[PDB]
Design an enzyme around this catalytic site. Structure first.
Site, PDB file in Angstrom:
ATOM      1  CD  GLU A   5      -2.936   0.919  -0.087  1.00  0.00           C
ATOM      2  OE1 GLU A   5      -3.133  -0.208  -0.588  1.00  0.00           O
ATOM      3  OE2 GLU A   5      -3.432   1.965  -0.556  1.00  0.00           O
ATOM      4  CB  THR A  54      -2.325   6.133  -6.096  1.00  0.00           C
ATOM      5  OG1 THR A  54      -3.209   5.703  -5.052  1.00  0.00           O
ATOM      6  CG2 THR A  54      -2.524   7.620  -6.337  1.00  0.00           C
ATOM      7  NE  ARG A 113      -6.869  -9.884 -22.936  1.00  0.00           N
ATOM      8  CZ  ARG A 113      -7.870  -9.302 -23.582  1.00  0.00           C
ATOM      9  NH1 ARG A 113      -9.011  -9.014 -22.976  1.00  0.00           N
ATOM     10  NH2 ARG A 113      -7.723  -8.999 -24.868  1.00  0.00           N
ATOM     11  CG  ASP A 124       2.319  -2.865 -10.354  1.00  0.00           C
ATOM     12  OD1 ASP A 124       3.221  -3.147  -9.540  1.00  0.00           O
ATOM     13  OD2 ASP A 124       1.158  -2.567 -10.003  1.00  0.00           O
ATOM     14  CD  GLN A 151       5.884 -13.024 -10.193  1.00  0.00           C
ATOM     15  OE1 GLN A 151       6.633 -13.790  -9.588  1.00  0.00           O
ATOM     16  NE2 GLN A 151       4.974 -13.449 -11.057  1.00  0.00           N
TER      17      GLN A 151
END
Ligand SMILES: C/C=C\C/C=C\C/C=C/C/C=C/CCCC(=O)O[C@H](COC(=O)CCCCCCCCCCCCC)COP(=O)(O)O[C@H]1[C@H](O)[C@@H](O)[C@H](OP(=O)(O)O)[C@@H](O)[C@H]1O
Ligand SMILES: CC(C)CCC[C@@H](C)[C@H]1CC[C@H]2[C@@H]3CC=C4C[C@@H](OC(=O)CCC(=O)O)CC[C@]4(C)[C@H]3CC[C@]12C
Ligand SMILES: CC(C)CCC[C@@H](C)[C@H]1CC[C@H]2[C@@H]3CC=C4C[C@@H](OC(=O)CCC(=O)O)CC[C@]4(C)[C@H]3CC[C@]12C
Ligand SMILES: COc1ccc2[nH]cc(CCN3CCCC3)c2c1F
Lengths: 235, 286, 336, 57
Positions: free
Chosen positions: A40, A45, A59, A81, A85
């Site tokens: 976070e 954002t 997909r 991004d 992972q």
């Protein structure tokens, strides 16, 4: 050699090679950025601020690596991004060597907050640790860092109520937005050991739609120009 | 005495050929050195290889023998090759400067538009200018004085041709490449200028080092170009107009010609044997 | 709780049993065997066309068709004989670090940082390779995948798990858990009855595809394991790790048989394969070299120098005629 | 963290009851396999270029 099958195979291979060359030169126009940060930490954002009016130009949902293609001032950016992972970063971080820059998003308002894993571990210290790890990899020696210090308003309210000395025992100064923000910026820029070869671009994320994307574009063009100057030996 | 001159000129020719061939081979075999900038540097090396192999042997023979013993037709061929290959080399220098200027000042063009087709168009343009300078003297615009003395191979001394060739080969290329590298210097200096006190001291030292480095590079580039070609073209523009009372010493004339000739030797030293990628490629090769 | 008291007791019992079974080292047994000698291999084919670091490759059963995967988002099917590109599949995700070619040759697998294993049908009615299936369910990056049949595929992922998938339905028929680190390697037994998986916990586990249970484990390495490969017999397997050492383990002896290490190498192994007879162990390293070891004598038989950046993938044909090494310099090399 | 302890201890106790052969037997078996198939390994013994698919047809 002269057989029809051999000629057909050779021309098929040549057509495939032409298509591969076209796709490679098309992808050479893409500016690859590696987006990183804590959970976070405003990563979502930043992503949603970029994909407002410029984006993507049965997909299966992945929750792996998220790919964001956008265009700013005739420059095409691929932004990756890696947030889903949950594994050892050392086993796949070499896949991103060669990206133009690493967009590191860190939330300013988590200095008071603590991680859920253990009470005695500040989220800000974890962000600094991960910044130190990614800024000094053997792969990212020449890759620049674009630092995004998100949540300036929440940080301002928190420092107005709570003191910053809890996150930084060595800190000693007036509780105000300017001094505390400058202190956080200098603390993150002091983790850079490869000072000569790479630069950290910092930006306090604002609510304006284009200022953050403009900063990313300016940093990327600066990186490109400085790489060209280095190629000529003028940098 | 002629043995020393012959061996020195042969050493110069051998060094130029070896350097240019090494640069061309390193670009050809290596996949790393396969971009537009290295394409232009390799074309410059090929042009200098043409100079070192085509005109440098006959020019050295003309220097040692102090006379031309190859015939009028071969003299015309040698003059044409000399002018074409030395104008092409200068215009490759001005193409490399232009490519650098476009890369430094136009990152969007560098990312979205820079293609090897641009390199091919620049190389073809340089060779076209070389042809446009070297061909006219054969097809007119020539005075019989060149054929007046069979034991000499002097270029056409016509005033119109003198102005045309000297301006289209050096002076326009000098002005253009000076302007381009001045703009590059301004851009580089602007980019460089763009406990906390220890960090500020380190940043100031790094900025000063970068400024010194960019001054050093723009010196070893323009200074070399000027020292090598300006002495030759000042004489080439002045002497045809000053027929009398401006006798040219033979030793000084030879020094001034071979300073220009040595630019083919010094071009790979600057544009190829300095950047780190070429050094790594050579280390891999050897 | 108190279970850790007996866990270490079981570990000590296993170690004591293994020590009891260990009477003569494999080096002592093969001491009288004459050395293989110098192995000199020359690059026969240089497959070009990839424009980014190549991360995986897999040979075909016909021993001439090859598949290679790289970070430019292309899965290339080559004809190694004529250096002819047979197929070029544009992957949905450029971040791929594994690829497998089906034994029947009809399908090809791919996967990577996206947690999906993509199965592409090569030969169809229109002759155009199409995405036959996308296998999701892993929560970490897919590190390896191997075909059992045209309908079953085993895949190891970075969430410390492996999974046996039925491609027809697309669901995990079986899941294999037990690793405490990211599983990086995956090798199938010749009979497709067992398979060994090496993870980042410096341990390799042998799994049964039917019962889905960890049959046995081998903890000999010091760092994470990147590559694994069964011996052609199927009773042994070699593991390469970032400890800059390979280790040959036995399945029936349930312990480590031999170690392949050198003083001049301090870079980890990224790829491991065996020759047809199993006498040569070919291991690619981070120093863009492939060391060929006498698998029975732990002696470096040869070096396959020629790659530029780093040998990321390596594979020996089923007939054993040639070995292909793919590296980060975007080139495949056939060595034969 | 006690539920996983039962699974781990069960795994260890099941892994310790497997039958193990002597390392001498496994070494002998690997050596026998390597020696029996040595003639069939093209990499081990160089193959003439006449029947080498990657050198000459
Ligand atoms: C008192 C105050 C001030 C003055 C005092 C001090 C400062 C200045 C002094 C005078 C300088 C003289 C020349 C300096 C040369 C020098 O420093 O060379 C360095 C080391 O080279 C080798 O190791 C390579 C060595 C081998 C070179 C070629 C040898 C073979 C020659 C024949 C060729 C044919 C046969 C092979 C490399 O150059 P560099 O470190 O100086 O810095 C840069 C260079 O200036 C840029 O041009 C270059 O950009 P490019 O234009 O694309 O090339 C950059 O990449 C970079 O190399
Ligand atoms: C190969 C043949 C054609 C000879 C060519 C020689 C030139 C290329 C030389 C002669 C004088 C040299 C310059 C002499 C001094 C300096 C200053 C030096 O930096 C400093 O000491 C800073 C000085 C200051 O800041 O005032 C960097 C190299 C440079 C520009 C040199 C660049 C190379 C130059 C132009
Ligand atoms: C910047 C680096 C690459 C050094 C470059 C040096 C060259 C420009 C030098 C090296 C040897 C020189 C030559 C050595 C000897 C002679 C003979 C000399 O003979 C004469 O015609 C005058 C004396 C006489 O009449 O015999 C004329 C100059 C010349 C060609 C020199 C011209 C200049 C050369 C080619
Ligand atoms: C009128 O004089 C001119 C005009 C333009 C020219 N372009 C190339 C040359 C030849 C340069 N070589 C170097 C040393 C001897 C000559 C030239 C020229 F000699």
């Amino acid at each position: 050699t002269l057989s029809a099958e051999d000629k057909a195979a050779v021309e098929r291979s040549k057509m495939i090679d032409r298509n591969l060359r076209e796709d490679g030169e098309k992808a050479a126009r893409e500016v690859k950025l590696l987006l990183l940060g804590a959970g976070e930490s405003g990563k979502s954002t930043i992503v949603k601020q970029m994909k407002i009016i410029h984006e993507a130009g049965t997909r299966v949902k992945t929750t792996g690596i998220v790919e964001t293609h956008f265009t700013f001032k005739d420059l095409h950016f691929k932004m990756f991004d890696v947030g889903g992972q949950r594994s050892e970063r050392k086993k796949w971080i070499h896949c991103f060597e060669g990206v133009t820059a690493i967009i590191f998003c860190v939330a300013l308002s988590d200095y008071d907050l603590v991680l859920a894993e253990d009470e005695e571990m500040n989220r800000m210290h974890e962000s600094m640790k991960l910044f130190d790890s990614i800024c000094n990899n053997k792969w990212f020696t020449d890759t620049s860092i674009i630092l995004f210090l998100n949540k300036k308003d929440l940080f301002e309210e928190k420092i107005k109520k709570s003191p910053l000395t809890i996150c930084y025992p060595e800190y000693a100064g007036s509780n105000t937005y300017e001094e505390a923000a400058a202190y956080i910026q200098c603390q993150f820029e002091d983790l850079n050991k490869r000072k000569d070869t790479k630069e950290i671009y910092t930006h306090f994320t604002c609510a304006t739609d284009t200022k953050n994307v403009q900063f990313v574009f300016d940093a990327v063009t600066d990186v490109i120009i400085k790489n060209n100057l280095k190629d000529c030996g003028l940098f | 005495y002629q043995v020393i001159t012959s061996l020195l000129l042969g050493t110069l020719i051998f060094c130029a050929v070896l350097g240019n061939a090494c640069v061309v081979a390193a670009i050809a075999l290596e996949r790393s050195l396969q971009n537009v900038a290295n394409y232009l540097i390799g074309s410059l090396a090929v042009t200098d290889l043409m100079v070192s192999v085509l005109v440098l042997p006959m020019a050295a023979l003309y220097q040692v023998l102090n006379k031309w013993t190859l015939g009028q037709v071969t003299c015309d061929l040698f003059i044409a090759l000399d002018v074409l290959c030395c104008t092409s080399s200068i215009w490759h220098l001005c193409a490399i400067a232009l490519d650098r200027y476009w890369a430094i000042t136009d990152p969007i063009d560098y990312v979205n538009k820079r293609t090897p087709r641009r390199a091919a168009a620049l190389i073809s343009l340089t060779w076209l200018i070389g042809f446009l300078i070297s061909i006219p003297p054969m097809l007119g615009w020539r005075t019989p004085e060149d054929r007046s003395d069979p034991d000499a191979c002097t270029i056409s001394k016509d005033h119109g041709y003198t102005i045309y060739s000297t301006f289209g080969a050096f002076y326009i290329p000098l002005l253009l490449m000076l302007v381009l590298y001045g703009r590059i210097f301004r851009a580089a200096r602007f980019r460089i200028r763009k406990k906390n006190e220890r960090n500020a001291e380190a940043k100031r030292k790094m900025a000063l080092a970068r400024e010194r480095k960019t001054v050093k590079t723009l010196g070893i580039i323009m200074g070399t170009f000027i020292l090598c070609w300006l002495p030759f073209f000042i004489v080439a523009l002045v002497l045809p107009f000053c027929e009398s009372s401006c006798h040219m010493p033979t030793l000084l004339g030879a020094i001034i010609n071979w300073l220009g000739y040595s630019n083919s030797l010094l071009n790979p030293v600057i544009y190829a044997y300095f950047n780190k990628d070429f050094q790594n490629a050579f280390k891999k090769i050897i | 709780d108190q279970l850790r008291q007996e866990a270490e007791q079981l570990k000590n019992q296993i170690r004591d049993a293994r020590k009891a079974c260990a009477d003569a080292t494999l080096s002592q047994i093969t001491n009288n065997i004459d050395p293989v000698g110098r192995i000199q291999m020359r690059t026969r084919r240089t497959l070009r066309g990839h424009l980014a670091k190549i991360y995986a490759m897999h040979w075909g059963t016909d021993s001439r068709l090859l598949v290679s995967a790289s970070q430019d988002g292309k899965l290339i099917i080559w004809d190694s004989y004529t250096t002819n590109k047979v197929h070029a599949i544009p992957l949905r995700s450029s971040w791929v670090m594994t690829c497998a070619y089906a034994p029947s040759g009809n399908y090809v697998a791919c996967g990577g940082l996206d947690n999906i294993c993509s199965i592409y049908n090569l030969k169809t009615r229109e002759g155009n390779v199409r995405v036959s299936r996308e296998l999701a369910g892993h929560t970490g990056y897919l590190s390896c995948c191997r075909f059992l049949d045209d309908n079953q595929i085993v895949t190891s992922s970075g969430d410390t798990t492996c999974a046996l998938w039925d491609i027809e339905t697309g669901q995990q028929t079986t899941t294999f858990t037990g690793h405490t680190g990211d599983v990086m390697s995956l090798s199938l037994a010749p009979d497709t009855r067992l398979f060994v998986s090496g993870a980042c916990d410096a341990s390799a586990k042998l799994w049964d595809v039917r019962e889905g249970m960890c049959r046995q484990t081998f903890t000999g390495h010091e760092s994470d394991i990147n590559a694994i490969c069964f011996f052609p017999n199927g009773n042994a397997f070699a593991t390469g790790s970032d400890d800059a050492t390979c280790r040959l383990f036995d399945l029936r002896a349930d312990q480590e048989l031999m170690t392949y290490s050198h003083d001049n190498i301090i870079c980890g192994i990224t790829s491991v394969s065996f020759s047809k007879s199993g006498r040569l162990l070919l291991a690619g390293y981070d120093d863009f070299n492939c060391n060929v070891w006498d698998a029975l004598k732990a002696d470096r038989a040869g070096v396959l120098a020629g790659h530029d950046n780093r040998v990321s993938c390596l594979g020996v044909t089923d007939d054993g005629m040639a070995v292909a090494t793919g590296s980060w310099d975007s080139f495949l090399k056939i060595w034969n | 963290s006690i539920a996983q302890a039962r699974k781990l201890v069960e795994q260890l106790k099941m892994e310790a009851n497997i039958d193990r052969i002597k390392v001498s037997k496994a070494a002998a078996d690997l050596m026998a396999y390597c020696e029996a198939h040595a003639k069939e390994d093209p990499l081990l013994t160089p193959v003439p270029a006449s029947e080498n698919p990657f050198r000459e047809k």
